[PDB]
Design a binder for this molecule. Structure first.
Ligand SMILES: NCCc1c(-c2cccnc2)[nH]c2ccc(O)cc12
Ligand code: NI
Length: 315
């Protein structure tokens, strides 16, 4: 079986009304939110959503998708429920154009960036996948995380399907990452020190918190409670926790503060720590800077900063 194109097999694709100002696949799918999408052919993005593989492409006004179900399921267009899953994945109920104008109303820097970089929105990811992805993110770039995640999924998760030479796996369950040889194997897969955090966090969630239902509870808890709970996990501090809050636990106000956000705040906003005394990063000054951004942009500050990240990844 081959990766589909809109030309190859137009009968297997469905469409979701979606303007380019609401979503640009190319500024979202490989801009360091999910690490599981790859443009296997030009303008066609393939990756795994929940134990199914999808290919996505778009026109100026339409999002086209096709689904591969794997197990000798006779090929067919996406069902309604599968299309709802995708609609919810891209959080398309939320108007990005209205958010853009609201941020721009208070921020002339954002206003200039947003001209060129429209359609940057936040995926709504599976908490398990997002958590271990961002554990892998420490001192790491998107390309290297992407490989670590692909090798992790091939080694520990269920095979779904092969298309061309790419074999697609589901993200593993916690119990699979918690096992006695897991760290050893994960070091063999190139994760380094991060192998220890992966295994230890899997074991902590399972044994201390009662399994992945805990992550669903964090999704309904308040931002501040979810963040703090995540920071109890091995390898998860304020930055990683804010990533997971923003991207998987429905906390749009979470602003992950790292060196890159510091540089943006200083360079582009002229920000310096007020209350804090540190000239540079510190847990307190990092907290202060996240508060600065929420004060500026509002309850969707995490989405705003995502535009600036995506913008910066493009030269
Ligand atoms: N300030 C950037 C933090 C960050 C994001 C991110 C993407 C979109 C929204 N918010 C944060 N993705 C990453 C991937 C690797 C990495 O080393 C850092 C990041
Ligand atoms: Ni200065």
């Amino acid at each position: 079986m081959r990766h589909r194109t809109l030309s190859s097999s137009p009968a297997l694709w469905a469409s979701i009304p979606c303007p380019r100002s609401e979503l640009r696949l190319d500024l979202v799918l490989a801009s360091g939110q999910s690490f599981r999408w790859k443009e296997q052919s030009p303008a066609h993005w393939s990756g795994v959503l929940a134990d199914q593989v999808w290919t996505l492409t778009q026109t100026e006004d339409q999002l086209y998708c096709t689904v591969y179900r794997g197990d000798d399921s006779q090929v067919s267009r996406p069902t309604l429920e599968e299309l709802e899953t995708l609609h919810k994945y891209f959080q398309l109920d939320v108007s990005l154009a209205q958010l853009y104008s609201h941020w721009a109303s208070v921020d002339s820097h954002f206003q200039r960036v947003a001209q060129k970089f429209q359609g940057v929105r936040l995926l709504r990811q599976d908490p398990t996948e997002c958590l271990f992805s961002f554990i892998c993110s420490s001192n790491n770039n998107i390309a290297r995380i992407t490989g670590m995640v692909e090798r992790l999924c091939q080694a520990f998760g269920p095979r779904l399907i092969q298309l061309d030479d790419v074999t697609y796996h589901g993200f593993p369950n916690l119990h699979a990452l918690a096992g006695p040889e897991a760290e050893t194997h994960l070091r063999k897969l190139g994760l380094g020190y991060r192998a220890r955090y992966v295994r230890a966090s899997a074991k902590a969630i399972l044994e201390e918190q009662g399994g992945p239902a805990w992550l669903q509870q964090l999704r309904v808890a308040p931002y501040e409670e979810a963040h703090k709970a995540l920071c109890t996990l091995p390898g998860v501090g304020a930055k990683v926790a804010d990533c997971i809050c923003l991207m998987a636990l429905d906390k749009p106000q979470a602003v992950p503060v790292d060196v890159h956000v510091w540089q943006i705040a200083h360079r582009d906003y002229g920000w310096h720590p007020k209350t804090s005394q540190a000239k540079g990063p510190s847990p307190l000054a990092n907290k202060e800077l996240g508060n600065f951004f929420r004060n500026l942009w509002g309850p969707y500050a995490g989405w705003a900063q995502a535009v600036l990240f995506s913008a910066d990844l493009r030269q």
